[PDB]
Design a binder for this molecule. Structure first.
Ligand SMILES: Nc1ncnc2c1ncn2[C@@H]1O[C@H](COP(=O)(O)OP(=O)(O)OP(=O)(O)O)[C@@H](O)[C@H]1O
Ligand SMILES: Nc1ncnc2c1ncn2[C@@H]1O[C@H](COP(=O)(O)OP(=O)(O)OP(=O)(O)O)[C@@H](O)[C@H]1O
Ligand SMILES: Nc1ncnc2c1ncn2[C@@H]1O[C@H](COP(=O)(O)OP(=O)(O)OP(=O)(O)O)[C@@H](O)[C@H]1O
Lengths: 104, 104, 104
């Protein structure tokens, strides 16, 4: 199995989820802060440049079978794409083992 | 080493932690939003079905040695289990390398 | 590629980020709750010991090339280090595949 981790623009989430549901995929979502090319505003306070604005991102973590992860990566990438800065990244990690807690 | 990631019902956390402490395991906990078979309420607003309720989950991330990860997976699964919908998932990922920041 | 996951003291974040920027590294940050040797206060309420204080941590997740991950691990470890309890951990995970959403 593969854990597909997508850091995306928050307003893209439901388009990504519709793309996932289209492929027969449940997922787990987190709110995170993004640092990268696109920057927020800062302010100097006591020898440090403090971030005064921040760039919310949505992290989608979804476990999938090896036989669908490539299709899932492309669907997320196409559903999350705008062509503008701050689009984000997809990281695929291998799952050594997965368990369904409800049944075992 | 293995990174064990458990998405569980929030009210199960302290039972899972007691199960971990029983096996000699520190852990890191996140609040996440769950999508899956169990669904929340939605509402139509401007060409989109907006989620008006959500399903909080607790994400437990705990790094363990290979010689205890199987026991850890089963303990979390048994401590997190209710037999009801929304129980969640456990994903085990391989750790290429781990570092204790305090000592190096 | 490698996904470097660092659980650190929140007040260390900007020092870690400066250490990352020094090496030519964007990153994704989460707020998490820490359990470990350093403990918070609890209170007995209805057959359970409830946590009344908690230990905020910052989770840094940064994807890097294999040819810089060791340097990145050490830079984070040195920038996040205080020598005091609660310093945290670094877990390195292998990335099977990464995608830039903006371009594909
Ligand atoms: N090395 C990284 N590791 C983890 N997350 C990253 C990394 N680089 C960027 N990100 C995430 O991607 C988000 C957007 O990145 P950035 O602001 O660089 O725009 P981008 O369009 O993705 O850039 P580009 O497409 O040129 O790589 C960031 O806010 C951050 O959450
Ligand atoms: N593919 C997935 N990847 C990541 N997290 C998932 C995935 N599927 C489900 N989850 C997580 O599991 C939680 C519960 O899942 P769901 O609502 O389907 O009930 P369940 O009892 O776990 O289902 P079942 O046991 O039938 O698989 C979700 O809210 C979500 O956080
Ligand atoms: N097994 C673990 N898996 C994931 N995160 C952990 C684990 N153990 C500790 N952590 C994280 O590390 C943080 C600090 O750990 P702890 O309180 O044990 O202090 P420490 O200085 O890191 O301990 P030591 O250096 O002696 O291992 C915790 O609050 C938790 O977020």
């Amino acid at each position: 199995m593969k854990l597909v981790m997508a850091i995306i623009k928050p307003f893209k989430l439901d388009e990504v989820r519709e793309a996932l549901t289209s492929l027969g995929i449940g997922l787990t979502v987190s709110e995170v802060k993004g640092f990268g090319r696109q920057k927020g505003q800062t302010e100097i306070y006591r020898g440090a440049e403090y971030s005064v604005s921040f760039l919310p991102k949505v992290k989608v973590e979804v476990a999938v079978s090896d036989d669908q992860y490539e299709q899932v990566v492309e669907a997320i990438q196409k559903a999350a794409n705008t062509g503008r800065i701050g689009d984000g990244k997809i990281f695929v990690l291998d799952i050594a083992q997965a368990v369904r807690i409800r049944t075992g």
